Amino acid sequence: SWEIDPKDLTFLKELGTGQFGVVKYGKWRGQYDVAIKMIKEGSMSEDEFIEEAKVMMNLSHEKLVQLYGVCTKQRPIFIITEYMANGCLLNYLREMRHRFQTQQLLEMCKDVCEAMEYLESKQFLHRDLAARNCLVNDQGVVKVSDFGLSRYVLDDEYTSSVGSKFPVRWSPPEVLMYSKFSSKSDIWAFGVLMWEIYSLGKMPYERFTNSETAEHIAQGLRLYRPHLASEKVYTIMYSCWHEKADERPTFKILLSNILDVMDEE
Ligand SMILES: Cn1cc(Nc2nccc(-c3ccc4c(c3)CN(C3COC3)CC[C@H]4NC(=O)c3cn(C(C)(C)C)nn3)n2)cn1
């Protein structure tokens, strides 16, 4: 049921390369757009991912990039997902031609927050939430992508909290200090994502290295208000960065807060 026949795929354009190698745009059965991850040899814990894929198939939300199936009888294995015509949110934000209105930026936050409230309701962690792991469709809707996949990455530079690819700038102090992941580390990352959206894709802590960032966060330094964020919007993103994880909100509370600011606005 989770298996797609790779003979049903037509490959049409290369999208780029991520942690697991090349991703392509194609058609399924001559008709339906898909994205196809071609998993590079050595990059993924494949047997564990294949077992988890059964669970991921049943995650379905309008603001989550849908997993359609896997092709596992051959190597490389393929992961087939919903196709998002406008690519990753980070690059979308950096395209100044869009001249975004702050109401559009708030709606991007709401899109992500609805997806994360859904994953929270299933006790499912994203584990690498960030604008680079969200995607944008042809209607400008933002959806959350590649949730949970961090668990199957074999590259130590990504897994090690001091590795060159670890998401230091999206991590709370208890992750940096103790590798304590929880719902509340996804919360922290979501606040950084809101900051990315309102900063039109600037790098968080852009004047600092990863090592310096970890030191400053531990000492209580925080990101500060982006020029395009109202005071009420900044209060929501800042609430995600309480030092004490248990003082951070849930995604349900964050969603209610975002909807309130939409009414103000
Ligand atoms: C340009 N573009 C793209 C579309 N559409 C579209 N639609 C659906 C999916 C995709 C897509 C999804 C993921 C990735 C790419 C594409 C390739 N992408 C390149 C740079 O930007 C093109 C790099 C990132 C890659 N990340 C991973 O594979 C990945 C990462 N993780 C971790 C969580 C870090 C473990 N796990 N999997 N792209 C339109 N234009």
Task: Please report, for the domain that includes residue 68, its CATH number.
Answer: 3.30.200.20
Is 1 within the bounds of a domain?
no
- Return the DSSP state at 246: G
Residue 56 near residue 1 (C-beta atoms within 8 A): no
Residue (of 227, 189, 187) closest to 100 by Cα position: 227
Task: Supply 200's token pair.
Answer: 């039109």
If asked whether residues 14 and 59 sit together in one domain, one would say yes
- 240-to-30, 70, 113, 174 alpha-carbon distances in Å: 44, 35, 12, 14
Q: Which run of H or of E encompasses 53? A: helix 46-56
E-assigned strands of 39-197?
Answer: 67-71, 78-81, 134-136, 142-144
Phi/psi-derived region of residue 29, left when phi > 0, alpha when psi is between -120 and 50, beta in every other case? left
Which residues does 66 contact at the CB level (< 8 Å), separation at least 6? 60, 81, 82
Q: In whole angstroms, what is the distance from residue 118 CA to residue 46 CA?
A: 26
Q: Is 146 in the pocket of ligand 1 (CB under 6 A)?
A: yes
Which residues does 120 contact at the CB level (< 8 Å), separation at least 6? 183, 186, 250, 251, 252
Is 224 within the bounds of a domain?
yes
Catalytic: 128? yes
Residue (of 26, 29, 6) closest to 14 by Cα position: 26
Task: Supply 1's token pair.
Answer: 């049921």
Q: In whole angstroms, what is the distance from residue 35 CA to residue 48 CA?
A: 22
- Return the DSSP state at 58: T
CA–centroid distance, 129 to ligand 1, in Å, is 13
The residue whose CA is least distant from atom 26 of ligand 1 is: 18
Is 96 within the bounds of a domain?
yes
21 is in an annotated binding site: yes
Amino acid identity, position 52: E
Burial, 165: exposed, middle or buried (Cβ in 10 Å; 0-12, 13-18, 19+)?
A: middle
Task: Supply 195's token pair.
Answer: 């900051």
If asked whether residues 98 and 55 sit together in one domain, one would say no
If asked whether residues 216 and 109 sit together in one domain, one would say yes
Half-sphere exposure of 166 (CA within 13 A, CB side): 18
If asked whether residues 36 and 144 sit together in one domain, one would say no
Amino acid identity, position 170: W
Which residues does 53 contact at the CB level (< 8 Å), separation at least 6? 2, 67, 70, 79
If asked whether residues 126 and 51 sit together in one domain, one would say no
Task: Supply 159's token pair.
Answer: 């897994």
DSSP alpha helices (H): ranges in 173-230?
Answer: 173-178, 183-198, 210-218
Residue (of 262, 242, 265) closest to 114 by Cα position: 262
Q: Is 83 in the pocket of ligand 1 (CB under 6 A)?
A: yes
Q: Which run of H or of E encompasses 26? A: strand 21-28
Residue (of 134, 115, 133) closest to 124 by Cα position: 115
If asked whether residues 255 and 221 sit together in one domain, one would say yes
Task: Supply 95's token pair.
Answer: 């395209």
Amino acid identity, position 76: P
- Number of helices (H) and strands (E) in the chain: give both, helices first: 9, 7
If asked whether residues 27 and 99 sit together in one domain, one would say no
Q: In whole angstroms, what is the distance from residue 258 CA to residue 66 CA?
A: 24
- Angle between helix 102-121 and helix 251-263 axes, rounded to 10 deg: 160
Amino acid identity, position 160: S
Q: Which of 30, 62, 82 is the last residue of a domain?
A: 82
User: How many distinct structural domains can be found in the chain?
Assistant: 2
Q: In whole angstroms, what is the distance from residue 198 CA to residue 206 CA?
A: 15
If asked whether residues 132 and 46 sit together in one domain, one would say no
CA–centroid distance, 258 to ligand 1, in Å, is 27
Compute how many other C-beta atoms are within 10 angstroms of the C-beta atom of residue 121.
Answer: 12
CA–centroid distance, 146 to ligand 1, in Å, is 8
Amino acid identity, position 189: A
Q: Which of 65, 82, 99 is the last residue of a domain?
A: 82
Is 92 within the bounds of a domain?
yes
If asked whether residues 145 and 78 sit together in one domain, one would say no
Is 106 within the bounds of a domain?
yes
Task: Report how this structure was experimentally obtained.
Answer: X-ray
208 is in an annotated binding site: no
Contacts 24+ apart (CB under 8 A), 24-33: 25/83, 28/4, 28/68, 28/80, 33/83, 33/85
The residue whose CA is least distant from atom 11 of ligand 1 is: 23
Is 97 within the bounds of a domain?
yes
Q: In whole angstroms, what is the distance from residue 145 CA to residue 82 CA?
A: 10
Is 214 within the bounds of a domain?
yes
CATH of the domain at 259: 1.10.510.10
201 is in an annotated binding site: no
Task: Supply 185's token pair.
Answer: 């580390």
Ligand 1 atom showing the smallest separation from residue 84 Cα: 7
| Active-site position among 5, 8, 47, 128 | 128
Q: In whole angstroms, what is the distance from residue 232 CA to residue 257 CA?
A: 9
Q: Provide the residue range defining the domain that includes 185.
A: 87-264
Q: In whole angstroms, what is the distance from residue 239 CA to residue 135 CA?
A: 25
Identify the bridge partners of residue 3 per DSSP, sorted by sequence position. 70
CA–centroid distance, 112 to ligand 1, in Å, is 16
Residue 233 near residue 198 (C-beta atoms within 8 A): yes
Residue 257 near residue 236 (C-beta atoms within 8 A): yes
Q: Are strands 32-38 and 67-71 parallel, antiparallel or unpaired?
A: unpaired
Is 13 within the bounds of a domain?
yes
Q: In whole angstroms, what is the distance from residue 23 CA to residue 32 CA?
A: 17
Q: In whole angstroms, what is the distance from residue 237 CA to residue 256 CA?
A: 13
Q: Which of 24, 49, 82 is the last residue of a domain?
A: 82
